Amino acid sequence: GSSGSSGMASSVDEEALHQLYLWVDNIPLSRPKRNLSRDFSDGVLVAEVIKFYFPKMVEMHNYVPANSLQQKLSNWGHLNRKVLKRLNFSVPDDVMRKIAQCAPGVVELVLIPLRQRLEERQRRRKQ
């Protein structure tokens, strides 16, 4: 069909999730076959999504993929003052802790708005 929706949804429905789950797949990301909620948690995956829109912004030189919470959080923390910051995006530690802990819905609550922001930069007439 087509992108159609009657009335403005004040809250987020269960459908919204799916739409966000598909959007990711659509984008050509250098990643194998595996859940998106289990990967994103890592963090290094988020920096990739941006690369598509803004490759320059991303560096992918400091961040390192690991399998330990310690590193996980350590990585996110920076991405908050290295990436988010640029996107005038801010988030408390309490929220992050959950993200790194591969928490369902938590990290997603940031993915929805995350994309909305990126676009905000596209339109912006940056010189």
UniProtKB/Swiss-Prot annotation:
Expressed in the intestinal epithelial cells (at protein level). Keywords: Actin-binding, Cell membrane, Cell projection, Cilium, Cilium biogenesis/degradation, Cytoplasm, Cytoskeleton, Flagellum, Membrane, Microtubule. One of its GO terms (cellular component) is cytoplasm. It is found in: Cytoplasm; Cell projection, Cilium, Flagellum; Cytoplasm, Cytoskeleton, Cilium axoneme; Apical cell membrane. One of its GO terms (molecular function) is actin binding. Residues 14-119 form the Calponin-homology (CH) domain. GO terms for biological process: axonemal central apparatus assembly; cell migration; cilium movement; filopodium assembly; lamellipodium assembly; microtubule bundle formation; negative regulation of microtubule depolymerization; regulation of cytoskeleton organization. The Calponin-homology domain mediates its binding to microtubules. Microtubule-associated protein involved in the stabilization of microtubules along the axis of migration during radial intercalation. Promotes the establishment and stabilization of an axis of microtubules required for the active migration of cells into the outer epithelium. Microtubule-associated protein that promotes microtubule bundling and stabilizes microtubules against depolymerization in response to cold shock. Homodimer. Interacts with actin, TJP1, CGN and CDH1. Radial intercalation is a developmentally reiterated form of migration by which cells move in a direction orthogonal to the plane of the tissue from an inner layer to an outer layer. This is Sperm flagellar protein 1. It comes from Homo sapiens (Human). The gene is SPEF1. The chain holds residues 1 to 120 of 236 of the full protein.
